[PDB]
Design a binder for this molecule. Structure first.
Ligand SMILES: *[C@H](CC(O)(O)[C@@H](NC(C)=O)[C@@H](O)[C@H](O)[C@H](O)CO)C(=O)O
Ligand SMILES: *[C@H](CC(O)(O)[C@@H](NC(C)=O)[C@@H](O)[C@H](O)[C@H](O)CO)C(=O)O
Ligand SMILES: *[C@H](CC(=O)[C@@H](NC(C)=O)[C@@H](O)[C@H](O)[C@H](O)CO)C(=O)O
Ligand SMILES: *[C@H](CC(=O)[C@@H](NC(C)=O)[C@@H](O)[C@H](O)[C@H](O)CO)C(=O)O
Ligand SMILES: [Cl-]
Ligand SMILES: [Cl-]
Lengths: 285, 285, 293, 293
């Protein structure tokens, strides 16, 4: 398959006031990432896409739109995880059918699952779809058990545990790791992660790529300067409301990024809009 | 509406080997609770029913079967909560249509929601269905905000916080509380909870009722004796695997309680079956 | 042995402005507990006594003062636990020499001690002093969570009599009484006295009994007689008081409440804030008027 | 001021079988660090020194011994924090009198101190001694989490120079360097030295540097020169060693590794298990053969 290393934006979705998908806005978000953020790929249907508040049919519509808009211009990963394994298989089969380059799946949540249940969940998605898989963050022995399946490619690493990150890269050198924390891209890159999947790349993809590339070249003081500016921006984004602020920043770039999906607050308050305007002036102008 | 105080079993669902609903087995589980466990009601579609691993259509089939089998013999509460608010509304409307006595909804999960988002979620389910609501476990000021909606009846209390339980009963005396922890029924009843919703009542409903009634009469030494035997049983159930052990115990009573739903381990190992046989001999014979 | 069941105040200590012990004030706190609060005994050197911010010599002084003032009128338990096991042994020997009825010790904290290390700590304090022991479990401050099997191992030592229980885990509490029915349990959460009494605890050790011991005894005795409605009413009033005490600052508010009774309860010890603000004082007076008048 | 940047071993202390300090052994540990580990300095009286299980007088003895043995060859930092603020002041004055270059103090623990109380604690130690201060942050043991605004308040005192950072939060670490670029940071997690060095920490204070100081300096200096591939290789070998040390028992394994070098590192202090088992000794020898040979 296609090269999956590098910078992947976790695709945000544009929603209408009524909560339905705004297709025109979603396609503008996709075009912004490919053409302006210059991402290596998109991670579709993840947490950042407000995926878990949606129906199976809405998830399928998003997978269709993103693949139709992106075509073969960039790599595409489809997050199909769920508490419902039959739904994960159904979404995995559909994304595979659409031509996604690989699948990914959050560990099943809501209930507490044992490690064997989690491994069976990943092995079943893989067996039923025929597609390769990127897991989510478990310790070194458990990653080894997951990696016994040759179709598990690696992990979207979110644990804030850089000792575990080092251990994983040492023990499983041929498996890939994508950093899942945009605000810790530098230290993750210092340990040799293969790429990053993140929500903030939808608007800060230029700096993210710079950090990643400068860090791999050993230009740590300059990379740190860019991580500092990036984190000032991320700090403002987190305080103001993560998905709504990224969408409001996209609107300032002429992208119809729309509303958030309920039960998340759907409409940005005037204060949230004002803060996004300030953040754009300070960090993205 | 119908009296909702007392003992409610959180209904377990029988599944076939392939994960589909075993309707004949589900109806036997329902009949066992009404006719033998002598419950005051059933709480359908909750955590114990393996609800969160199911499709919207499977949840509807379970709501239909339970209401058709129970008819008007007992009170019926329908848990319709989800990370998807549109799905919660759709399930709430269907359960209301079937004649369920009231709805209930877990707080939206997977994402971290603010209190205002959680209140909006409950107010929306109520507004769109016209049904009363039982919330899930937040502090005293937040319960007060939820209780501003006159259609919020009370809470299925799971927090292991008996100071908060006392505060809630004092501050909101006309709102109901159902204990959600079977192993702490006595102390909850000592503080005046109005009933209990629990998974273990599917097989230990006689002792549960005895504990509740003895405790309300102030017969605490005898209630404690029955809670001790109950908790020896619960301890064995938890160690062996909660839903599978209750199902295996039901099979020993001639109830086709079936398999669990994947991603949970679906089939009981021989060791799990042996332990259930031992538990039945010691506590339910 | 001198009976250890019932109502025990976790003794508060009066400090001067400079942090030294105010002996006169401490004796007034003790008298107030014995004579007005009608306690069965005092738990001296616990968390409520500001014990872990003090020197070994200060701890010995408080032990001497409390035994000299109380004499033989009440039961006395001495909390001597610490991260320093040699200090715990030193304090346990001294409290034993003074005539304390039993020792108690918090699980060793700061470092992440294994269960075997925790068990060796209790066995050493007992062996070196010859005194009985009450395990002091307070997971919220120590981070130490011991399960039912671990209590069993501790109870293999016949001089371990029971536990001062503060976990907010009533399942574990029930399991302790099921497994070790003859071992004692003292509830450590005053705001949850009713439900703990419903599960058969043998007494209670608490900070709010320094000012609310009358109500605390009522809740305990009414619950044991099965008078739940009456007990719950007194727990409700108690918990309005406790809610206010907690919001205003626990240590300082109980001392200010005691000062309004004529007890020189003094200042708190630094690094805790030593002096109450005007707002804290005003709130203490309002709480006294409403609940202890 | 005497430069405080670089590699600092958190000094381990040699104890006799009865728990008393083994002075000869402690001097050998110090010599080993200065002469073979080539440290820039020692952090004395920290968690690794088994400090919180000791008496004030034992702490003073370790401070005297370390300064007398090291003389002026290296930088010396004295950790004097405690739940007892009067003890921290007493120890800070004594370490200042002995000539320690700077003081350090763990956030006060056990009780849930507010931020203002924590800030008053640092300001008091500084004011009463006249010495500079390094905040010691170790949320995993204390449960105290301070955010960026709180560090700012602490840094309002110009004698607070920086922090010994152990949180497993590299976002916070980056925020500290962004906001207070001239304030110092010492990484406190030896297994995460590379990524912390990528974020510009000024040095490292760690327990494994007592035996792995050569590799630790390499990782630090290679990372600062941007030689990531080389640094990562040495971090990999280091982390195989650390993984084994952690699994076998951290304190005891480092002491056993030191004994294999001819250093009388002694026993651990009780309530920690004092003697290594035969299996722990055998594993220490295997780790030495593989990684420190
Ligand atoms: C024991 C007394 C105590 O630990 O039980 C107190 N603990 C706490 C949590 O502070 C207890 O009385 C509380 O003060 C009270 O319930 C209010 O929360 C001792 O001091 O050693
Ligand atoms: C400071 C040294 C330290 O706190 O940084 C040590 N801390 C811990 C978590 O034990 C550190 O060196 C570790 O020992 C090491 O990274 C292995 O986990 C001090 O002792 O005060
Ligand atoms: C992957 C998402 C992802 O990595 C984000 N995770 C969270 C908790 O938000 C991450 O990019 C985050 O938004 C930023 O680091 C800001 O904290 C996915 O499935 O979307
Ligand atoms: C309500 C369920 C419920 O109260 C159970 N909760 C959990 C965590 O299992 C409870 O009955 C539990 O099974 C027993 O107390 C045993 O611990 C629902 O929605 O099902
Ligand atoms: Cl590999
Ligand atoms: Cl009410």
């Amino acid at each position: 398959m296609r090269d999956l290393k590098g910078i992947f934006s976790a695709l945000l979705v544009s929603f209408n006031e009524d909560g339905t998908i705004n297709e025109k806005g979603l396609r503008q978000i996709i075009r912004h990432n490919i053409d302006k953020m210059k991402v290596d790929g998109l991670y579709v249907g993840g947490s950042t896409g407000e995926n878990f508040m949606l129906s199976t049919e809405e998830k399928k519509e998003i997978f269709r739109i993103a693949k139709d808009e992106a075509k073969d211009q960039i790599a595409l990963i489809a997050q199909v995880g769920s508490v419902n394994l039959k739904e994960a298989v159904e979404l995995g089969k559909y994304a595979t059918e659409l031509g996604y380059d690989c699948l990914s799946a959050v560990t099943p949540f809501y209930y507490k699952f044992s490690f064997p249940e989690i491994k069976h969940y990943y092995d079943t998605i893989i067996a039923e779809t025929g597609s390769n898989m990127i897991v989510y963050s478990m310790g070194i022995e458990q990653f080894g058990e997951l990696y016994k399946n040759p179709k598990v490619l690696g992990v979207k690493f979110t644990a804030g545990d850089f000792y575990l990150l080092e251990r994983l890269k040492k023990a499983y050198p041929n498996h890939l790791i994508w950093a899942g924390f945009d605000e810790m891209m530098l230290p993750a890159a210092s340990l040799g992660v293969d790429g990053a999947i993140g929500s903030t790349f939808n608007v800060n993809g230029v700096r993210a790529r710079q950090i990643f590339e400068l860090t791999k070249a050993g230009k740590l003081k300059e990379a740190l300067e860019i991580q500092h500016v990036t984190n000032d921006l991320i700090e403002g984004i987190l305080a103001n409301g993560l998905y709504l602020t990224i969408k409001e920043l996209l609107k300032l770039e002429g992208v119809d990024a729309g509303y958030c999906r309920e039960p998340m607050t759907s409409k940005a308050t005037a204060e949230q809009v004002a803060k996004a305007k300030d953040l754009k002036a300070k960090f993205l102008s």
